[PDB]
Design a protein around this ligand. Sequence first.
Ligand code: WSR
Ligand code: WSR
Ligand code: WSR
Ligand code: WSR
Lengths: 293, 308, 309, 294
Amino acid sequence: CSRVIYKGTDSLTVVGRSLDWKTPIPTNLYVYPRGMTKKSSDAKGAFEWTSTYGAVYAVGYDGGITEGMNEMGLVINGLFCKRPPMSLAVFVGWLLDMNATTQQCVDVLKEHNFSIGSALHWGITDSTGHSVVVEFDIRIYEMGEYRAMTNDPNWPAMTAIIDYWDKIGGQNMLPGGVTSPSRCVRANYFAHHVKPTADPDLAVSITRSIVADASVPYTYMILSSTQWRSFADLKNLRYYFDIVTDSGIYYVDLTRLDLYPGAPVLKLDTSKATNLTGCANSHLKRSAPFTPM
Amino acid sequence: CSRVIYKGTDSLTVVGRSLDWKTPIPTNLYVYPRGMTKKSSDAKGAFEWTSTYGAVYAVGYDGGITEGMNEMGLVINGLFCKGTVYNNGDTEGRPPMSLAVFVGWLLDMNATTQQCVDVLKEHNFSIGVSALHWGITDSTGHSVVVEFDHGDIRIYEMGEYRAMTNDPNWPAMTAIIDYWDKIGGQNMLPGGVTSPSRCVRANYFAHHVKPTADPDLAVSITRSIVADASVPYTYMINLSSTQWRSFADLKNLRYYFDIVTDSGIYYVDLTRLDLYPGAPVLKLDTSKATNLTGCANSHLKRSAPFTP
Amino acid sequence: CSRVIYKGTDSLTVVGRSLDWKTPIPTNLYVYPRGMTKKSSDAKGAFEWTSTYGAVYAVGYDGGITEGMNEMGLVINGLFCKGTVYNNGDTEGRPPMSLAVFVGWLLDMNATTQQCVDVLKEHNFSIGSALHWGITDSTGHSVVVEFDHGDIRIYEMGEYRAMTNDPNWPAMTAIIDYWDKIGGQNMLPGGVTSPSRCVRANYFAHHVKPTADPDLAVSITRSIVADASVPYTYMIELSSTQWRSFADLKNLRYYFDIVTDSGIYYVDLTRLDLYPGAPVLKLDTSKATNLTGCANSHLKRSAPFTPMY
Amino acid sequence: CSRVIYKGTDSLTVVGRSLDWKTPIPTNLYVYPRGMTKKSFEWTSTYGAVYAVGYDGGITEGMNEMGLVINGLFCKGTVYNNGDTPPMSLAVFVGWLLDMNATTQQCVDVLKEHNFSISALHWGITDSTGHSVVVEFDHGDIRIYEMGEYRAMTNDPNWPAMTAIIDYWDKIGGQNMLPGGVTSPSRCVRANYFAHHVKPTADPDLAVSITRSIVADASVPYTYSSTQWRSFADLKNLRYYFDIVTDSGIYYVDLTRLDLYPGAPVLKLDTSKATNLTGCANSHLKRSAPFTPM
Ligand SMILES: *CC(=O)CC[C@@H](C)[C@H]1CC[C@H]2[C@@H]3CC[C@@H]4C[C@H](OS(=O)(=O)O)CC[C@]4(C)[C@H]3CC[C@]12C
Ligand SMILES: *CC(=O)CC[C@@H](C)[C@H]1CC[C@H]2[C@@H]3CC[C@@H]4C[C@H](OS(=O)(=O)O)CC[C@]4(C)[C@H]3CC[C@]12C
Ligand SMILES: *CC(=O)CC[C@@H](C)[C@H]1CC[C@H]2[C@@H]3CC[C@@H]4C[C@H](OS(=O)(=O)O)CC[C@]4(C)[C@H]3CC[C@]12C
Ligand SMILES: *CC(=O)CC[C@@H](C)[C@H]1CC[C@H]2[C@@H]3CC[C@@H]4C[C@H](OS(=O)(=O)O)CC[C@]4(C)[C@H]3CC[C@]12C
């Protein structure tokens, strides 16, 4: 994974994110309205919650939420990193359903009133640009001025490598490898050295170019090839998505969807959207909630 | 700018190409049929030729052919080279050949890369800064680099090399590529936007991706290689932001094209067009088509030959 | 500044170090015997201690102990660290310890690296020029001591062999671990910055042949330290290496050479009188521009250096 | 192996040279006077010179009494003879140029004739004026390149491909990043960068110390191939320094204080006995016989 934060002008913030894996990971888009009651897990002692906000989920294998953006502009991305039970399939949605800002996610995660059941670490950004890194004891790191976030190593060891290369100068040398530190240093440098703009369509084009450079070429094997990329427009509530083999990039506009209590669940089958561009709201079909694995 | 050659399986060759420049360069796609008589230049002593093969051109400013692909699978891409000097004292007088139709003259009259080598070796012309060097690849995968060293056409066989950027010249570029090859691309690669760095990365990844006989998958792989070698848009702090990218499918005769700010990538299929002599010239305005994907032969409208 | 640890065979351990600075630092060697009463500082509340072990000190400006090696094989090396903060709110009121005699205090009373860790873990002193130390005993056990805002952070060097300046040891090991995954045989950072010098020295220390020859182990350590040594008259507005030191921990030999001198010499502590009442010896390095071999005959009787309290 | 060129002020030029090999190479110093008739055709030595003779059978490098310095470095792709190419043995090829020539321009004129046939290696020649070139055999043809602004010289690849790598790393800026490996391009880039950024002086002793610090930074650690010995030639003062990496001292031979007239004896310095020698080693130059060429 490679997660980039682009802060344009006029409070415009775009969060890029690319999925790198040796095998294709079937991921579909699900739009959930408010008022839905979900369970934390299927084991004994699991708790429930009613979704306060509506959100769109990038559900991999139609079983677990890899990432998502809610109607408040809150974005949470899950990245690989080598008490009441809280499954990983609904952990991202539980924070999206109940919280509106990054600070609200930090307060709930600081309580740690849950257990979790090859692992992951998350990055949470709100519409205000406040971004943190959550890594498991739970450790919440404030990104501050950092813009990129990949897999390994941990965040303290990552910022050390970032500060080491920042003294060398990105204008002079950057690591061109596919390793997570190499992709993080490149993405962080480019995120600081691109022009800030107020146009939402241009900010996604700029964020796409940074994520493209930090992307692993497809079928790379001498095998974490980039499978797909996502870009969240936090100010305009647009969630972009594209498969690296498809011909068009499309977005789901939450401001044009019915997220009220009682609305039906919509689903975008990405396997049937190979040539779709522009807004993909009309291609959302009324479906049932995905079954947690 | 980066030019990548992808050789899949079953004689499938895809030539990627990205245009990197500070300001946007208006580029439109033109489809020329056979039997068209064109002029090399407007100066005294220019010669004429009748196009033997139909080709699609990527004409910049609607005045000069940047790159193109003919109906035989021959692809020629023009890239900048700062130290290019086109004429000397022995080229003085040889018929003038403008850079606006230089790529088209090699595409209209030649079918293979070797035919382009035989014509360029004669060097019976002069060239009239658009200091550029070219990479020519035919459907069989044979690729060469053409550079002007003070009025001297220097042709190099790419052989196992897969990438081709700007400066320095090809011999010094091959040395930098071989130097980094011993270092190990899996261990370390240059991650800058300079021409050698982009050439070393795109050459390494072109060798370490899976070859395939799928024409669509081959294009998707070439896109990912060119995307990594592409300079991020609005890179501020010469050859700056990547403005557009093109991918030519040599076996299936498809010429892909996409603007980095556009939302879709489309292609022009030459096998589904009337390439007989006398056919109308077709133009694809890349400024009008913004959300177009798949085959772009639809939005091809009838236009007139572009004016050099 | 760079610090390299070499572990050959038969418990042979050599600790190499190079001093990098813009201007030349006058450094003289002093040999102190046992039973010398010294003051931790000149301020109020300073304590005193009697030297348990005889040692050799590399005293810069003849007023402060940069590094040293006691007769037990314990070596302590002080290296600059920009982010070092010695005192905080919890250290105010503790007995003052001057940086001029801090290295000698640990070398006088302690014999192993663990004994220094226990003494530093108590932290019954306040320090009164930001540096961090590397301590190695005859057995090869080595640690890194850093003051993180009035907090003695002690890290086990473990399998790491090198130690330069900035950043701190956790961030430094993260850079070392990143480059180790690239492969030193494939690519190494060749700059004069502190992380680039540490990765090179740590790699080469692991990939040289271990030997039991005390003279070969020093020559091998010299080649690694010289590789991490900044060329002379080169500076950055991380400057030139002024001198290099090498300590043979098993044989109690302390090698020394100036980068501009034509020879390297060593002080053999086994061939010196360190009993209580022995005189303090001094070796003026400015007068040994062509001295090679054992330099015990050149040490002259001298009064103890005056610490710059 | 690395060859560094240091130009101080007041026409002061020092050429450093380190020998890197997996096994130690016995190299002794031989001071040859003028008027000696040697065999390749034959020639009578015009100038006296000191020779770093490896295995006591071949001249590795050397400096003549005119300030001309020639260093020999290994090269993997060197082919000496072809179909177009008197036999000239490599054991005396360095001496023949040092005996009959005084300037770097004189060596280029003689080698350009190529009236002779020749361990593949290439050479770097520098005269007292600072003019330096690189001589390489490319499939029988002799290629002579002007070093000009370049200061370092190692092994492979050839000089054109080496200057491209140096120029490639020059754009990055040595103050930012340098290649830290032990490969020939990495060592040549580091030595060239530092040779442009050390303060040049008129002090001949400070020049050799600065030149040593550059060559020592470009030397491969011992037992890692491993650097065996380093040499430094002071062109203006006619001093040839020499030290073994495992020894404890660095000594030199001062040609200005030696008898090089026709009829003088051949002086040999056994480096296996000067383990603790520093300063001028002229007094330790014992009289001996000319070495036996391989
Ligand atoms: C960063 C990368 O490219 C590599 C990590 C990538 C393969 C991961 C990242 C997010 C994962 C999904 C998270 C949601 C669920 C969690 C399920 O775990 S379970 O609850 O223990 O069963 C597994 C499925 C899925 C969809 C994860 C798949 C792997 C990821 C996409
Ligand atoms: C990707 C690169 O190599 C960077 C350079 C880029 C801006 C060039 C490369 C090809 C050029 C076009 C070639 C065709 C004509 C040539 C004309 O030259 S002239 O005849 O001397 O006027 C200029 C116009 C044009 C369209 C070139 C424009 C610049 C390029 C796209
Ligand atoms: C690695 C570097 O860049 C720094 C090396 C060198 C310049 C330093 C290393 C050890 C220092 C000395 C330590 C002992 C005393 C401490 C005094 O500080 S005070 O007590 O606060 O006054 C200053 C003098 C001296 C001698 C230090 C000088 C600098 C060092 C030799
Ligand atoms: C690291 C390097 O570049 C190589 C340094 C070292 C190993 C070489 C340098 C000069 C060599 C000697 C040159 C003279 C003769 C040549 C003979 O070749 S032959 O005639 O083909 O037999 C071999 C012996 C000798 C003494 C060379 C030995 C190797 C070198 C000292």
